[PDB]
Structures are given as C-alpha cells and as structure tokens.
Write a protein that binds this ligand. Structure first.
Ligand SMILES: [Zn+2]
Lengths: 4, 423
C-alpha cells in the first residue's frame, strides 16, 4: 500500500 | 529473453490457455472475466476489482460530502476495450522494466518460485492444494479447469488510487504469515501516478507542495510485488505490528501509525524503526513456521490429484523454501539458508533499492504526505520506455529526472486532484  | 513473451492485445481471441475467461475463488458468484497469462504463474485481469471483496462491488463515488483526503473516484475508468488494451500493455511494460534490472529479475524469480504451499489437506499423510490459490479457466469445450497461480494483477476497486495486495484467507490458517503463502491479487493501475516533492522538508509536510515530481509507476508496482513476495512466502508482518510515528510532528498530532510491513517494504532508513529485538522475534517466528512446513512435508506419504507427482511437489517446495534433505530423505530448515532467504525477501527487495536500480527520483521515506494524482500514459514509447521510464535518453528529459518533472514534461501528466491541505 502507498500509505498517506 | 523478455519476461512477457507475447505482446497481448485485449481483443485477441480467447484460446483457453493464456487468453481465457476465468472465475476466481471469491466464495461467491461472478460472471467470467477475460484474463491474460503473461508469464508462468502470473495473470493479468484488466477489470476494476469488484471480485476479491463482494462488499466492494460499487465503483460509484459517494456524495461530495463523504470523499476523504487521499482518494480518487471514477466509476468509468477501465470500462472500455481500449482502456483494457492500454492497461494490459501498461502492466506488461512495467513488468519488463522491472525484469530488466538485476534486482527485478531476482524478485520476479522469487515470486514465480513462491508457489503457495499445498496445505489444504485434512490428513497429515497426504498433501493437497488449497483451492483458493487457484483460478478456474474456461477451456475450449466450455468446461472449467483449475489452475494454480501465484500472482494476479487486477484493476483498482472503487478508490482508484488504493493499490494493495489482496488474497483469500483460510478458515484457520493465516496463509500470509504462517510460511504457506497464498495467491496474491494486486490492485494496481499503470494509468495514474502520484506527485511528490524534491525537498524532504516539503514532502513530509502536509501543507506544502503541489507535487512537482511524478513517481515512476515501476517503483509503485515493485513496491506491491515486494509485499506479494512476503505474502507468497508467508512471512508478511502482522498489520497489528505498527510504528507509533514519533519522527514527524504532523503524524504525531494525529496519532498516525504505520505498519512494520510497510516500513520493511520501503526499506532504507525506514526499516530501522523496527528495533533489533522485535526484528529477531519475527525472524525466529518465521523460522519456526518454515520448520513446520518441513515437518508437514515429511509426514506426507501420498498426493491428492493427478496434476503432479508427490515427489515433484516435494521438490518444488524444497526449492521454494531452500530446505535441506538428509540421507533418510527427511527435510529440515537450515538456519543459514533460512536467514539468507528471509533477508533476500525482506532487506534486498525493497522500494529504496529499486529506486537505486531504476535511477529515478522518488520519495525518500514512506513517512511523507501525498501531493497529487496525475493521469499518465506509459504505453507510447515516446512517453515512457522499459529502459528509462519517463527520463528518455538522448532527449531533454534524460538528465536531472526531467522526465519525472511534471512542470518540464507537462505533456505527460494531467493533474486530476491535489491532496495538499486536505489532511
Ligand atoms: Zn505498501
């Protein structure tokens, strides 16, 4: 996941 | 030599082998979807993912008073044949870009060798495949045939930019954390990318920057493939194991936490937030899991099915887990070999290392703030190549990451949404  | 031997066209006629209508084991009902097998054990489904999670079959965007911060919705994306054709070609191009590097070749080889363990048997004297690590392929005669696979690249669900690895669980076994592994479905799109800032103080601040530089989609896919590798070897770190971020005031003032699995995957200095003690804890834990796999293999005496022989499957897993076989033929886990494989999968295959191989500009840490999302088209060679990504050699885009500079190479990026200030 890319994350924030 | 290429990773993908054939340059598929979405409209190529199905043949029931590497171009076929298939169904996935989502424990539910679905109409068959056209899929393409681009490499041994690897398939691509150019469809929005409304299948892995039946409770996520709605692509429609909620009212304006519901959309959060980092998210992008477009229910029409990837609904036409031309889009699916471009998606297929885009994903294949990224696999080639990744494979063209020694690191990517190593990662992809590990992934293909990472066949999900045959642990679906109820009796310990026989080995049986786990059906959720297979897909059902419609043959030329209309019948379904079960095919084992390791990886599936599929379009994103409702939130287009929420890329992630999805896999079917087991009633008792935690396949992605018990050494077994499971087929990985990566929600991903080669048609969009994200903007980051060149200055660390700006990139890690939620109020600054518009996203001058664009992330190379090959890095984004590689990041997911790294997660996939962890999950296929059943060594992913439990998501409940997180780092209470205390190195960024903005993360802190919101009590934001980041999983160790993500820090490990990014690598570099981020991986250092996982202390030695907890790291050793995980290593020992997964060492024990590999031990159980070695023992389960020894207890096996017969195989279920006729797809392959028992000795053949024992060999594929001997190679996957790099087990040792003594004179009596019994399998065991060698500490040296385990540490080497575990380290390869967790320390060698990292986002930070791929950046070094691709020679691209990229976020310096996972602990930053997204800036924007851009629409791109990497299919045309005049836009992006396997060898240079956006930074085309012998052009004004070759140096200083000019190709990733959205201001200089503005013709290759269309900003769809700005995220800065929305956190
Ligand atoms: Zn991630």
């Amino acid at each position: 996941r890319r994350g924030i | 030599m290429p990773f993908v031997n054939k340059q598929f066209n979405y409209k190529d006629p199905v043949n029931g082998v590497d171009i076929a209508y298939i169904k996935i084991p989502n424990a539910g009902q679905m109409q068959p979807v056209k899929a393409f097998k681009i490499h041994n054990k690897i398939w691509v489904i150019p469809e929005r993912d409304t299948f892995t999670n039946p409770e996520e079959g709605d692509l429609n965007p909620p009212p304006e008073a519901k959309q959060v911060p980092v998210s992008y919705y477009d229910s029409t994306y990837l609904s036409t044949d031309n889009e699916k054709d471009n998606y297929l070609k885009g994903v294949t191009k990224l696999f080639e870009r990744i494979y063209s590097t020694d690191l990517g070749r190593m990662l992809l080889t590990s992934i293909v060798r990472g066949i999900p363990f045959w642990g679906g048997s109820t009796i310990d004297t026989e080995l049986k495949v786990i059906d959720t690590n297979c897909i059902n392929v419609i043959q030329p005669d209309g019948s379904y045939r079960s095919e084992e696979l390791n990886l599936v690249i599929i379009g994103p669900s409702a939130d287009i930019i929420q890329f992630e690895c999805k896999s079917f669980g087991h009633e008792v076994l935690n396949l992605t954390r018990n050494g077994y592994g499971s087929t990985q479905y990566i929600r991903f799109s080669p048609d969009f990318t994200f903007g980051f800032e060149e200055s660390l103080e700006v990139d890690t601040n939620p109020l600054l920057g518009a996203g001058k530089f664009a992330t190379d989609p090959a890095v984004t896919l590689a990041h997911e493939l790294i997660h996939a590798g962890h999950r296929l070897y059943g060594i992913a770190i439990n998501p409940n194991r997180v780092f209470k971020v205390n190195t960024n005031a903005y993360y802190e003032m919101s009590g934001l936490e980041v999983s160790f699995e993500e820090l490990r995957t990014f690598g570099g200095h981020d991986a250092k937030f996982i202390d030695s003690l907890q790291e050793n804890e995980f290593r020992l834990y997964y060492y024990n899991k590999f031990k159980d796999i070695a023992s389960t293999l020894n207890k096996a005496k017969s195989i279920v099915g006729t797809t392959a022989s028992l000795q053949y499957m024992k060999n594929v897993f001997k190679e996957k887990y790099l087990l040792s076989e003594d004179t009596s033929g019994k399998f065991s886990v060698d500490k040296l070999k385990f540490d080497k494989l575990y380290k390869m999968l967790t320390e060698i295959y990292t986002e930070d290392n791929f950046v070094k191989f691709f020679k691209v500009l990229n976020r310096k840490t996972y602990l930053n703030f997204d800036k924007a999302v851009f629409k791109i088209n990497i299919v045309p060679k005049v836009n992006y190549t396997i060898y240079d990504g956006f930074n085309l050699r012998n052009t004004n885009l070759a140096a200083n990451f000019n190709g990733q500079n959205t201001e200089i190479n503005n013709m290759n990026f269309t900003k769809l949404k700005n995220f800065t200030g929305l956190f």
